[PDB]
């Protein structure tokens, strides 16, 4: 059956720390593609807002920038239902998805006509990561 809870989606969630740690390892893109992130998109009433987003690709931007203790030119091609955009890795959160964020994501997904991921797909991804 299909994913319905934030906890489930958490097993393929990548923190900014991990991304920072891995962004120079070959097959970074193979590893992170299909994973999900909690992406910071700005402020709402002067309070930071975040979104569930799927990594659909890794981009090599024209600009090297600072990511914690390292530097990279990489960006994440991130999908939130119908919305797809490239974000710098620095805007990824290290925190888990709120139920709220997850529900908003579900709503965007249904509005878009996009099937949610199954647990099989998710477990496949998780396992793959755990191995390499």
From Swiss-Prot:
Upon changing residue 85 to E, the result is: Loss of binding to single-stranded DNA
Residues crossing the lipid bilayer are none
Q: Where is the Plus3 domain?
A: 3-132
Cell compartment(s), UniProt: Nucleus, Nucleoplasm
**What's the domain of life for this entry?**
Eukaryota
Q: Which function does this protein serve?
A: Component of the PAF1 complex (PAF1C) which has multiple functions during transcription by RNA polymerase II and is implicated in regulation of development and maintenance of embryonic stem cell pluripotency. PAF1C associates with RNA polymerase II through interaction with POLR2A CTD non-phosphorylated and 'Ser-2'- and 'Ser-5'-phosphorylated forms and is involved in transcriptional elongation, acting both independently and synergistically with TCEA1 and in cooperation with the DSIF complex and HTATSF1. PAF1C is required for transcription of Hox and Wnt target genes.
User: Quaternary structure?
Assistant: Component of the PAF1 complex, which consists of CDC73, PAF1, LEO1, CTR9, RTF1 and SKIC8; the association of RTF1 appears to be less stable than that of other subunits. At least in HeLa cells a N-terminal shorter form of RTF1 is also found in the complex. The PAF1 complex interacts with PHF5A.
Q: What is known of its domains?
A: The Plus3 domain mediates single-stranded DNA-binding.
Protein name according to UniProt = RNA polymerase-associated protein RTF1 homolog
Taxonomy-wise, where does this protein's organism fall, top ranks first?
Eukaryota, Metazoa, Chordata, Craniata, Vertebrata
